[PDB]
C-alpha cells in the first residue's frame, strides 16, 4: 500500500458539527468583543441600512415564534451588513403590555391577596418587565442573532413614556382625539373598554331567540287589524331589557299572518319553515305606514316605538330588529335619530345594577346578576312571547387578555377619529383615513398580498378607542378644565407634563397634585383642573416606537421612515396598522418603507402549539436537539411566509443539507491547506474544466445573490445546493481528486485547482454567512489560507469579491462550452451504469473510450468521464452511435488505482515520478 504517499490533505475542520457545545462560545465571544458594535464601527460602511424592531412582551421565555422573527430579522441584516452597510437594529420590548399586568393579578388570586397601590403595583409590574427583558435577551442571543442588545429600547424607560406622550400630544394638537359616548366592545372581565387588536374571535354557542312584541291597542286600530305582534330574532336576551324600537327596512312590504305575526315578506318562507310563524298570510302592509307605530315589550312590558333603519338586512332574522341603543352602536345612532332613551343599566363587571329598579326595566330579583348567567332565566319569562328558541355556533369578540367573551356597553371614552378632516403638513386637508389609504400605496409588502390585508382592514376600520381601564401603561394625561369641562391642550401645560416624565417617568401623574403637575403660571388656576385617569391603548404606544426609537434618537437608532419591518401577518391587525395610522397622523406617511411577514409555528399537523392541546416544543429542546446552525437553516431553507411545521422528519432533512454544506466546506479547506500562499500572489494557467467551474461558480453566485435580494432564501439556497451537489461536487472534485491526491506538491495544475476550491469556498462563506453564522466563523478559524485570501480575521472581515481580480484572469476570455461534452457524459454513465448491473465492469476506470465525435477535447472527456483511457484498445465491451467502449489495455496502479500500468502491481509512470521525487 501506497496511501502514506499521497498527498495527506486534511483540515482541523471537523465533520462534525458538535453545535450544542461550539455554538455557546462563539456566541459568548461575540458578546464579550462586542461584535454588533464592531459591524457598525466598520471604516469602510458605504450606504446605510435600519430594521426597526417591533417590540415582544416582556413576559414570559422565548417560544418558537419569537425565535423563528428574530432568526429571518438576523439574515435580513446580516445580508444588508455583509453587502457593506452600516446597519442600524435596536431590539426593543414593549413593558406595559396587557399579559404584564394580567400576569400579576393571576399571581396575587392565586395567592389570594390584591394590590391597590398604584405606585407599588406599577413597580411590581416593571420589576417584572426588568426580569422577563433580561430571560428573553439571552434566550435571542442563544440563536447566534446581532443587534444592539445591549442597548435595546424599552417602553417602561423614562424618555421612552415621554415618548408616547408626545406622539398623543401630536394627534391631540392635529384635532383627532375626541371624548365619544357609544356603546363600545366591554371587557367585564377586566373592567375595561377594548378596540380591535385586543379582541380574539372565538366560535362560541349561543341562545337564539324569535320573539313576539304585541302592537298596543291604539296602534292596532290605527293599522286597522285585530291582531298583530312584530317578532324579532335576537342571540342576546340579555339586552331586552333596554330595547326601545323595532326597526324596519325602509319601504319594504311586512307579511300578516292568521294567528297575528308580522314579520317581513320576504322571509316569511323561511320563517313558517322554521315554524316561528305560520303560513298563512291575511295582509301585508308597507313598513312606511309602521313606522311610529308602537309595541309592548314582554318582558318588562315597556312600549317600543317603530322605527325604521338604515339597511335593515333581510338575510337573516324576521325584518323587524330589536333595538338597545345601550349595547349596540348602531342601536345607539338609531336611538339619537328618533330622541329616544339610551337604556344601560349593566356595569362596569357586566352585572345588571340598580338602574333596572329605578327604571322598571327588569325584575329585581336579577340586580347584581351577570348579563350572560340572566340569559337562562329571561328566556323562561318571556312565557308565550317566545316563539321558538334554537341554541347556534357564531364567531363571537373575547377580551384577548382575559379570554373571556366581551359586551357592548356605552360608556364615554377617548378616540382617535378616521373621518375627520385634519390639516397635512403640506398644508392640505385629509381625513386620516385617506391618508393611511395613501402611505400604504407608497409600502413595498412582502408578499404583495400584505398589502390588501392592511389596506381592507384601514377601509373598514372604526374610530380607535384609547383609552382603557387598567393598572399599568402610561396615562392619557391631560386635565379637564371644570370650568369649560373640556381637555387642556395648551402647548405649555402638555410640555410641562412631557418634560416632567422624561425626568422622572409617569409615576408623577399619580403621586403629584395638580399644582404640582403644572407649570408655574397655572398653578393659580389649579382648583380648576382634574387629572384625566384613562391608561393609553398599549397598542398606541407601540404603534409609538418609530418617534421614540427612530425620530427621538435623531439617526442614531436607524432613520424615519426604516427600511424595514419584518413581523408576523398577524401583525397587519397589529402593530403594522397601529404604527401606520401614528405615522400618517405624525408625518402623513407610514414610518416604514416595507414590510416582510413570516407565519406561524404549527406543529406536525399543522395545527397551532398550546399547552392544552399538548403539542407544544419548546425553543430550548429544539435547540439542544439540533442546535441553532440547523434550525437556523430549517428557517431559511423553507416557505417562513406561510406557517412552518415542526416536525423529525423535516429537521432529518435540514441536517442532511447542513451536513452536505459542511461535509463540502470540510473537503475544501483538506484540498488547499497544504497549497504555498505565494500562489495567492501570481496568476494561473487554468484548465478548460477549472474556467468552466470559475464560469459555472459566477453564474450560480449571481442566482443566489438575487434570490437573497428578495428574500426568497429557498430559492438561493436551492441554486447553492445544486451548484454544490452537481458541478462542484458530482464533476468537478470527482475530475479532480487524482490531482489533489497523487499528483506533486509542486504540479501547477494541481495548485490551479486548489485555487479553484479556493475562490469557490469563498462564495460559500460569502453567501452562507448570514444564515450560518457560526459555522463560517468556525471554517475561517480553521483556514490561515481562506483568511489571507479574504483578508479577514473572522467572518465580520467578509466581502463580496471578484474572483476574476483575485484569480488574475483575462477580461476578454471567452467561456467555456460544455454542452457537447456534458451530453456524452451522460449518455457514457448511462452506459457504464448497464454495464455494472451485468457485472460486466465495476468502475468507469477500467474502461476505455473511444469517441466518435473528433471535435471534442480528450483529456477533457477523460476527466468528465473518469475514464483510464480515451482511444481504440482490444476488448470491446459495447458500442453507441456516440463511441465505443472497451476494457483499458493497462493493469491497475498500486498507488492511484488508475488503469494506466504498463506492469501489473506496479506504480504508473506519473506516480512513479512523483514517488521518487527530490
Ligand atoms: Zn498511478
Given at each position: 500500500?501506497?496511501?502514506?504517499?499521497?498527498?495527506?490533505?486534511?483540515?482541523?475542520?471537523?465533520?462534525?458539527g458538535?453545535?450544542?457545545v461550539?455554538?455557546?462560545?462563539?456566541?459568548?465571544?461575540?458578546?464579550?468583543?462586542?461584535?454588533?458594535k464592531?459591524?457598525?464601527?466598520?471604516?469602510?460602511?458605504?450606504?446605510?441600512?435600519?430594521?426597526?424592531?417591533?417590540?415582544?412582551?416582556?413576559?414570559?421565555?422565548?417560544?418558537?415564534?419569537?425565535?423563528?422573527?428574530?432568526?429571518?430579522?438576523?439574515?435580513?441584516?446580516?445580508?444588508?451588513?455583509?453587502?457593506?452597510?452600516?446597519?442600524?437594529?435596536?431590539?426593543?420590548?414593549?413593558?406595559?403590555?396587557l399579559?404584564?399586568?394580567?400576569?400579576?393579578?393571576?399571581?396575587?388570586?392565586?395567592?389570594?391577596?390584591?394590590?391597590?397601590?398604584?405606585?407599588?403595583?406599577?413597580?411590581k409590574?416593571?420589576?417584572?418587565?426588568?426580569?422577563?427583558?433580561?430571560?428573553?435577551?439571552n434566550?435571542?442571543?442563544?440563536?447566534?442573532?446581532?443587534?444592539?442588545?445591549?442597548?435595546?429600547?424599552?417602553?417602561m424607560?423614562?424618555?421612552?413614556?415621554?415618548?408616547?406622550?408626545?406622539?398623543?400630544?401630536?394627534?391631540?394638537?392635529?384635532?383627532?382625539?375626541?371624548?365619544?359616548?357609544?356603546?363600545?366592545?366591554?371587557?367585564?372581565?377586566?373592567?375595561?373598554?377594548?378596540?380591535?387588536?385586543?379582541?380574539?374571535?372565538?366560535?362560541?354557542?349561543?341562545?337564539?331567540?324569535?320573539?313576539?312584541?304585541?302592537?298596543?291597542?291604539?296602534?292596532?286600530?290605527?293599522?286597522?287589524?285585530?291582531?298583530?305582534?312584530?317578532?324579532?330574532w335576537?342571540?342576546?336576551?340579555?339586552?331586552?331589557?333596554?330595547?326601545?324600537?323595532?326597526?324596519?327596512?325602509?319601504?319594504?312590504?311586512?307579511?300578516?299572518?292568521?294567528?297575528?305575526?308580522?314579520?317581513?315578506?320576504?322571509?316569511?318562507?323561511?320563517?313558517?319553515?322554521?315554524?316561528?310563524?305560520?303560513?298563512?298570510?291575511?295582509?301585508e302592509?308597507?313598513?312606511?305606514?309602521?313606522?311610529?307605530?308602537?309595541?309592548?315589550?314582554?318582558?318588562?312590558?315597556?312600549?317600543?316605538?317603530?322605527?325604521?333603519?338604515?339597511?335593515?338586512?333581510?338575510?337573516?332574522?324576521?325584518?323587524?330588529?330589536?333595538?338597545?341603543?345601550?349595547?349596540?352602536?348602531?342601536?345607539?345612532?338609531?336611538?339619537?335619530?328618533?330622541?329616544?332613551?339610551?337604556?344601560?343599566?349593566?356595569?362596569?363587571?357586566?352585572?345588571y345594577?340598580?338602574?333596572?329598579?329605578?327604571?322598571?326595566?327588569?325584575?329585581?330579583?336579577?340586580?347584581?346578576?351577570?348579563?350572560?348567567?340572566a340569559?337562562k332565566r329571561?328566556?323562561?319569562?318571556?312565557?308565550?312571547?317566545?316563539?321558538?328558541?334554537?341554541?347556534?355556533?357564531?364567531?363571537?369578540?373575547?377580551?384577548?387578555?382575559?379570554?373571556?367573551?366581551?359586551?357592548?356597553?356605552?360608556?364615554?371614552?377617548?378616540?382617535?377619529?378616521?373621518?375627520?378632516?385634519?390639516?397635512?403638513?403640506?398644508?392640505?386637508?385629509?381625513?386620516?383615513?385617506?391618508?393611511?389609504?395613501?402611505?400604504?400605496?407608497?409600502?413595498?409588502?412582502?408578499?404583495?398580498?400584505?398589502?390588501?390585508?392592511?389596506?381592507?382592514?384601514?377601509?373598514?376600520?372604526?374610530?380607535?378607542?384609547?383609552?382603557?381601564?387598567?393598572?399599568?401603561?402610561?396615562?392619557?394625561?391631560?386635565?379637564?378644565?371644570?370650568?369649560?369641562?373640556?381637555?387642556?391642550?395648551?402647548?405649555?401645560?402638555?410640555?410641562?407634563?412631557?418634560?416632567?416624565?422624561?425626568?422622572?417617568?409617569?409615576?408623577?401623574?399619580?403621586?403629584?397634585?395638580?399644582?404640582?403637575?403644572?407649570?408655574?403660571?397655572?398653578?393659580?388656576?389649579?382648583?380648576?383642573?382634574?387629572?384625566?385617569?384613562?391608561?393609553?391603548?398599549v397598542?398606541?404606544?407601540?404603534?409609538?416606537?418609530?418617534?421614540?426609537?427612530?425620530?427621538?434618537?435623531?439617526?442614531?437608532?436607524?432613520?424615519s421612515?426604516?427600511?424595514?419591518?419584518?413581523?408576523?401577518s398577524?401583525?397587519?391587525?397589529?402593530?403594522?396598522?397601529s404604527?401606520?395610522?401614528?405615522?400618517?397622523?405624525?408625518?402623513?406617511?407610514?414610518?416604514?418603507?416595507?414590510?416582510?411577514?413570516?407565519?406561524?409555528?404549527?406543529?406536525?399537523?399543522?395545527?397551532?402549539?398550546?399547552?392544552?392541546?399538548?403539542?407544544?416544543?419548546?425553543?430550548?429542546?429544539?435547540?439542544?436537539?439540533?442546535?441553532?446552525?440547523?434550525?437556523?437553516?430549517?428557517?431559511?431553507?423553507?416557505?417562513?411566509?406561510?406557517?412552518?411545521?415542526?416536525?423529525?422528519?423535516?429537521?432529518?432533512?435540514?441536517?442532511?443539507?447542513?451536513?452536505?454544506?459542511?461535509?463540502?466546506?470540510?473537503?475544501?479547506?483538506?484540498?488547499?491547506?497544504?497549497?504555498?500562499?505565494?500562489?495567492?500572489?501570481?496568476?494561473?494557467?487554468?484548465?478548460?474544466?477549472?474556467?468552466?467551474?470559475?464560469?459555472?461558480?459566477?453564474?450560480?453566485?449571481?442566482?443566489?445573490?438575487?434570490?437573497?435580494?428578495?428574500?426568497?432564501?429557498?430559492?438561493?439556497?436551492?441554486?447553492?445546493?445544486?451548484?454544490?451537489?452537481?458541478?462542484?461536487?458530482?464533476?468537478?472534485?470527482?475530475?479532480?481528486?487524482?490531482?489533489?491526491?497523487?499528483?506533486?506538491?509542486?504540479?501547477?495544475?494541481?495548485?490551479?485547482?486548489?485555487?479553484?476550491?479556493?475562490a469557490?469556498?469563498?462564495?460559500?462563506?460569502?453567501?452562507?454567512?448570514?444564515?450560518?453564522?457560526?459555522?463560517?466563523?468556525?471554517?475561517?478559524?480553521?483556514?490561515?489560507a481562506?483568511?489571507?485570501?479574504?483578508?479577514?480575521?473572522?467572518?465580520?472581515?467578509?466581502?463580496?469579491?471578484?474572483?476574476?481580480?483575485?484569480?488574475?484572469?483575462?477580461?476578454?476570455?471567452?467561456?467555456?462550452?460544455?454542452?457537447?461534452?456534458?451530453?456524452?457524459?451522460?449518455?457514457?454513465?448511462?452506459?457504464?451504469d448497464?454495464?455494472?448491473?451485468?457485472?460486466?465492469?465495476?468502475?468507469?476506470?477500467?474502461?476505455?473510450?473511444?469517441?466518435?465525435?473528433?471535435?471534442?477535447?480528450?483529456?477533457?472527456?477523460?476527466?468528465?468521464?473518469?475514464?483510464?483511457?480515451?482511444?481504440?484498445?482490444?476488448?470491446?465491451?459495447?458500442?453507441?452511435?456516440?463511441?465505443?467502449?472497451?476494457?483499458?489495455?493497462?493493469?491497475?496502479?498500486?498507488?492511484?488505482?488508475?488503469?494506466?500500468?504498463?506492469?501489473?502491481?506496479?506504480?504508473?509512470?506519473?506516480?512513479?515520478?512523483?514517488?521518487?521525487?527530490?
Amino acid at each position: 500500500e501506497y496511501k502514506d504517499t499521497l498527498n495527506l490533505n486534511t483540515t482541523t475542520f471537523s465533520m462534525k458539527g458538535n453545535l450544542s457545545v461550539n455554538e455557546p462560545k462563539t456566541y459568548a465571544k461575540w458578546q464579550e468583543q462586542q461584535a454588533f458594535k464592531r459591524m457598525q464601527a466598520r471604516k469602510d460602511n458605504h450606504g446605510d441600512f435600519t430594521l426597526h424592531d417591533g417590540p415582544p412582551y416582556a413576559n414570559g421565555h422565548l417560544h418558537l415564534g419569537h425565535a423563528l422573527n428574530k432568526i429571518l430579522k438576523d439574515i435580513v441584516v446580516k445580508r444588508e451588513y455583509f453587502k457593506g452597510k452600516k446597519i442600524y437594529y435596536t431590539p426593543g420590548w414593549d413593558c406595559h403590555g396587557l399579559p404584564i399586568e394580567q400576569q400579576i393579578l393571576e399571581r396575587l388570586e392565586k395567592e389570594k391577596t390584591s394590590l391597590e397601590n398604584p405606585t407599588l403595583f406599577r413597580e411590581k409590574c416593571r420589576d417584572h418587565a426588568k426580569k422577563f427583558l433580561e430571560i428573553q435577551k439571552n434566550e435571542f442571543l442563544q440563536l447566534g442573532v446581532l443587534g444592539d442588545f445591549e442597548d435595546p429600547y424599552k417602553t417602561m424607560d423614562f424618555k421612552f413614556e415621554a415618548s408616547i406622550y408626545r406622539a398623543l400630544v401630536e394627534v391631540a394638537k392635529k384635532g383627532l382625539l375626541k371624548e365619544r359616548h357609544k356603546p363600545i366592545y366591554w371587557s367585564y372581565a377586566c373592567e375595561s373598554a377594548l378596540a380591535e387588536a385586543e379582541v380574539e374571535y372565538k366560535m362560541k354557542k349561543s341562545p337564539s331567540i324569535f320573539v313576539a312584541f304585541g302592537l298596543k291597542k291604539e296602534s292596532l286600530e290605527k293599522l286597522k287589524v285585530k291582531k298583530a305582534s312584530l317578532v324579532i330574532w335576537t342571540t342576546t336576551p340579555w339586552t331586552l331589557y333596554a330595547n326601545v324600537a323595532i326597526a324596519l327596512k325602509k319601504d319594504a312590504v311586512y307579511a300578516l299572518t292568521q294567528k297575528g305575526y308580522l314579520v317581513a315578506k320576504a322571509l316569511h318562507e323561511k320563517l313558517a319553515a322554521l315554524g316561528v310563524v305560520d303560513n298563512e298570510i291575511t295582509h301585508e302592509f308597507n313598513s312606511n305606514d309602521l313606522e311610529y307605530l308602537v309595541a309592548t315589550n314582554p318582558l318588562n312590558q315597556r312600549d317600543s316605538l317603530v322605527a325604521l333603519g338604515e339597511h335593515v338586512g333581510l338575510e337573516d332574522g324576521t325584518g323587524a330588529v330589536h333595538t338597545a341603543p345601550g349595547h349596540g352602536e348602531e342601536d345607539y345612532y338609531l336611538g339619537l335619530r328618533y330622541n329616544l332613551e339610551v337604556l344601560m343599566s349593566v356595569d362596569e363587571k357586566g352585572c345588571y345594577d340598580e338602574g333596572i329598579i329605578h327604571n322598571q326595566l327588569l325584575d329585581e330579583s336579577y340586580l347584581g346578576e351577570h348579563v350572560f348567567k340572566a340569559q337562562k332565566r329571561i328566556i323562561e319569562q318571556l312565557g308565550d312571547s317566545l316563539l321558538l328558541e334554537q341554541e347556534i355556533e357564531h364567531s363571537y369578540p373575547h377580551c384577548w387578555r382575559t379570554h373571556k367573551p366581551v359586551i357592548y356597553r356605552a360608556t364615554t371614552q377617548w378616540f382617535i377619529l378616521m373621518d375627520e378632516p385634519f390639516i397635512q403638513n403640506d398644508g392640505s386637508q385629509k381625513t386620516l383615513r385617506e391618508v393611511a389609504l395613501d402611505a400604504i400605496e407608497k409600502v413595498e409588502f412582502v408578499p404583495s398580498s400584505g398589502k390588501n390585508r392592511l389596506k381592507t382592514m384601514i377601509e373598514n376600520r372604526p374610530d380607535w378607542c384609547l383609552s382603557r381601564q387598567r393598572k399599568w401603561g402610561v396615562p392619557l394625561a391631560f386635565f379637564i378644565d371644570k370650568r369649560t369641562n373640556k381637555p387642556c391642550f395648551e402647548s405649555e401645560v402638555l410640555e410641562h407634563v412631557a418634560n416632567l416624565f422624561e425626568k422622572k417617568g409617569c409615576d408623577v401623574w399619580w403621586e403629584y397634585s395638580v399644582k404640582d403637575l403644572l407649570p408655574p403660571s397655572y398653578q393659580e388656576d389649579a382648583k380648576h383642573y382634574e387629572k384625566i385617569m384613562h391608561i393609553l391603548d398599549v397598542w398606541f404606544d407601540s404603534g409609538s416606537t418609530f418617534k421614540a426609537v427612530l425620530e427621538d434618537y435623531h439617526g442614531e437608532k436607524g432613520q424615519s421612515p426604516s427600511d424595514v419591518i419584518l413581523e408576523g401577518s398577524d401583525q397587519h391587525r397589529g402593530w403594522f396598522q397601529s404604527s401606520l395610522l401614528i405615522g400618517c397622523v405624525l408625518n402623513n406617511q407610514a414610518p416604514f418603507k416595507k414590510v416582510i411577514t413570516h407565519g406561524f409555528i404549527v406543529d406536525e399537523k399543522g395545527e397551532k402549539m398550546s399547552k392544552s392541546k399538548g403539542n407544544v416544543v419548546s425553543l430550548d429542546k429544539l435547540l439542544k436537539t439540533h442546535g441553532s446552525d440547523v434550525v437556523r437553516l430549517w428557517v431559511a431553507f423553507n416557505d417562513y411566509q406561510n406557517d412552518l411545521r415542526v416536525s423529525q422528519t423535516f429537521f432529518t432533512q435540514t441536517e442532511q443539507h447542513y451536513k452536505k454544506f459542511r461535509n463540502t466546506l470540510k473537503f475544501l479547506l483538506a484540498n488547499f491547506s497544504d497549497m504555498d500562499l505565494k500562489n495567492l500572489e501570481r496568476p494561473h494557467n487554468f484548465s478548460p474544466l477549472d474556467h468552466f467551474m470559475l464560469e459555472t461558480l459566477e453564474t450560480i453566485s449571481a442566482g443566489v445573490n438575487s434570490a437573497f435580494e428578495e428574500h426568497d432564501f429557498v430559492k438561493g439556497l436551492n441554486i447553492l445546493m445544486a451548484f454544490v451537489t452537481n458541478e462542484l461536487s458530482g464533476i468537478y472534485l470527482d475530475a479532480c481528486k487524482d490531482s489533489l491526491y497523487c499528483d506533486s506538491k509542486n504540479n501547477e495544475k494541481r495548485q490551479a485547482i486548489q485555487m479553484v476550491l479556493l475562490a469557490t469556498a469563498s462564495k460559500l462563506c460569502y453567501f452562507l454567512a448570514p444564515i450560518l453564522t457560526h459555522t463560517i466563523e468556525e471554517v475561517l478559524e480553521h483556514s490561515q489560507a481562506l483568511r489571507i485570501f479574504l483578508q479577514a480575521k473572522d467572518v465580520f472581515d467578509l466581502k463580496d469579491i471578484s474572483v476574476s481580480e483575485k484569480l488574475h484572469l483575462k477580461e476578454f476570455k471567452k467561456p467555456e462550452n460544455f454542452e457537447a461534452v456534458l451530453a456524452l457524459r451522460s449518455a457514457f454513465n448511462e452506459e457504464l451504469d448497464r454495464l455494472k448491473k451485468e457485472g460486466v465492469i465495476k468502475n468507469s476506470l477500467e474502461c476505455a473510450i473511444e469517441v466518435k465525435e473528433k471535435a471534442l477535447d480528450e483529456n477533457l472527456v477523460e476527466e468528465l468521464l473518469m475514464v483510464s483511457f480515451v482511444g481504440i484498445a482490444k476488448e470491446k465491451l459495447s458500442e453507441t452511435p456516440a463511441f465505443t467502449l472497451f476494457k483499458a489495455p493497462f493493469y491497475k496502479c498500486p498507488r492511484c488505482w488508475r488503469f494506466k500500468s504498463e506492469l501489473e502491481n506496479t506504480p504508473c509512470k506519473r506516480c512513479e515520478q512523483v514517488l521518487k521525487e527530490r
